Amino acid sequence: GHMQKPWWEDEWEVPRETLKLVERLGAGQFGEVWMGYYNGHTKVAVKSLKQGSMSPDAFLAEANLMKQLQHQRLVRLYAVVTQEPIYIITEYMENGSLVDFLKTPSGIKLTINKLLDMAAQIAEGMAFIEERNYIHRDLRAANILVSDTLSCKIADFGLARLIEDNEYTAREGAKFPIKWTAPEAINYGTFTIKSDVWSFGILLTEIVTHGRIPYPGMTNPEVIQNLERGYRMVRPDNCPEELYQLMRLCWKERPEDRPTFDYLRSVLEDFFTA
Ligand SMILES: COc1ccc2c(C(=O)Nc3ccc(NC(=O)c4nn(C)c5ccccc45)cc3C)cnn2c1
Ligand code: NI
């Protein structure tokens, strides 16, 4: 079929009557996530924006990773509904978030080879985001989605940014998850692909521990103080030393000394094929 839209609606608009919401999967501050059906036969995930939590323009900006980047390693945007309640429709990921999947009976049983494969799959998606001049800014296991075939995809919830001059600076009152955030981003609000690399090293600890919180037994101030002295996270239990040394490259003090996502992908592939 290669041989064969109103301006006031989004270019990605679908009529709401093409969707049937079936099961509530979760609820947050910005809204609820549902499993639904598009035109009866296609399973979809629908995010309904909570009326008042944030502006329509920010939730539906064309800036904007999902509208701009498509890749097998990235959760695919399907459509939007721009009349209230605002819907964001995406491909359905049967096994949900990686952090939840790792705690299920099948996730607990994952061999180290499968955990490294999944880590290589995230680095592959991040190598695409890097090459496209984007930063993710919230790279943690909670934002990785898992398919029915146990493949991983990166999801964006509005923090990803197109970088023009290699860096984005966050606002004065911005609050980020401290345990995943690189020192230069905590201190100066400066986010680059290199602060995503730092975050990936933290995400690797969530993968190897089957969803445990990074820096066990430590508060956010104790984490910042430790980092300032040159300490890094204590070797997690059941963490292969080779993986720990790859995590440490991600945690180099100078952002420019941290590896690229392509390098990380290449090493992780070698780790699970060896
Ligand atoms: C089985 O359990 C589960 C649980 C969850 C899911 C999802 C899922 O979560 N998909 C998904 C991913 C990202 C978004 N994006 C946003 O919510 C969004 N918010 N802002 C502010 C944005 C700004 C710009 C762009 C996007 C956004 C929406 C959905 C719907 C897919 N399968 N699946 C299965
Ligand atoms: Ni054709």
Side-chain angles (χ1 to χ4, degrees), residues 1-10 12-28 30-46 48-49 51-56 58-61 63-82 84-163 165 167-170 173-174 176-211 213-224 226-274:
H2 64 300
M3 287 300 155
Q4 289 70 45
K5 277 273 183 82
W7 68 263
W8 64 91
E9 301 190 336
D10 194 288
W12 299 76
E13 202 81 19
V14 291
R16 208 194 298 276
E17 58 262 41
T18 64
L19 303 151
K20 183 189 189 70
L21 275 60
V22 178
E23 193 196 347
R24 189 209 58 91
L25 301 176
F30 309 108
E32 12 170 50
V33 189
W34 288 81
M35 179 279 286
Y37 290 108
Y38 170 86
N39 286 9
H41 301 300
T42 305
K43 215 162 177 184
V44 300
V46 186
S48 65
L49 166 77
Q51 204 275 97
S53 67
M54 70 187 288
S55 67
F59 192 72
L60 302 149
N64 187 257
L65 201 119
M66 292 188 95
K67 286 174 95 185
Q68 300 299 326
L69 305 193
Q70 287 141 97
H71 193 276
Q72 293 299 134
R73 299 277 55 78
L74 270 55
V75 172
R76 179 184 185 96
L77 178 67
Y78 279 178
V80 298
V81 173
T82 58
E84 261 160 30
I86 298 164
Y87 288 178
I88 289 182
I89 307 98
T90 76
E91 79 183 310
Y92 191 72
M93 301 297 294
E94 191 128 283
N95 286 305
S97 91
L98 180 63
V99 80
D100 291 337
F101 178 68
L102 298 165
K103 296 171 184 161
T104 68
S106 72
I108 284 162
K109 285 183 200 74
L110 296 183
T111 62
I112 185 64
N113 277 167
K114 184 58 186 171
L115 295 175
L116 292 166
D117 164 22
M118 287 176 130
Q121 295 188 24
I122 298 152
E124 184 181 330
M126 283 304 311
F128 181 70
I129 287 170
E130 176 168 13
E131 186 269 337
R132 295 285 94 203
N133 282 350
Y134 277 81
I135 59 177
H136 187 276
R137 282 206 299 142
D138 201 13
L139 181 59
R140 55 189 284 180
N143 294 325
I144 302 311
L145 300 179
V146 186
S147 75
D148 68 313
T149 63
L150 313 174
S151 65
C152 298
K153 294 183 200 251
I154 303 166
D156 175 44
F157 300 95
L159 289 186
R161 294 289 180 273
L162 169 67
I163 42 88
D165 303 57
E167 60 179 80
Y168 168 89
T169 307
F176 1 83
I178 300 293
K179 284 178 181 196
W180 283 264
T181 308
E184 70 281 1
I186 285 173
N187 301 337
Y188 311 104
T190 59
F191 290 83
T192 66
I193 196 61
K194 302 303 192 180
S195 13
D196 287 340
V197 166
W198 179 288
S199 301
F200 184 79
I202 307 293
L203 203 169
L204 285 179
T205 79
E206 299 182 271
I207 290 177
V208 88
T209 62
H210 300 273
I213 298 160
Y215 306 97
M218 290 174 71
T219 65
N220 293 327
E222 290 166 342
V223 170
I224 289 152
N226 262 218
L227 297 176
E228 275 165 15
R229 300 184 72 181
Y231 287 173
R232 293 302 184 253
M233 199 182 313
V234 165
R235 280 169 177 89
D237 292 308
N238 315 125
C239 186
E241 185 65 8
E242 288 162 88
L243 186 64
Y244 184 67
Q245 289 305 322
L246 195 67
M247 289 168 178
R248 295 188 71 252
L249 284 186
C250 298
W251 307 325
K252 284 190 164 280
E253 260 279 286
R254 299 196 311 167
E256 64 268 28
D257 290 343
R258 300 174 198 155
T260 64
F261 279 107
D262 192 63
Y263 176 85
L264 288 164
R265 179 212 41 89
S266 189
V267 174
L268 285 164
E269 285 181 0
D270 280 10
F271 287 174
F272 84 90
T273 65

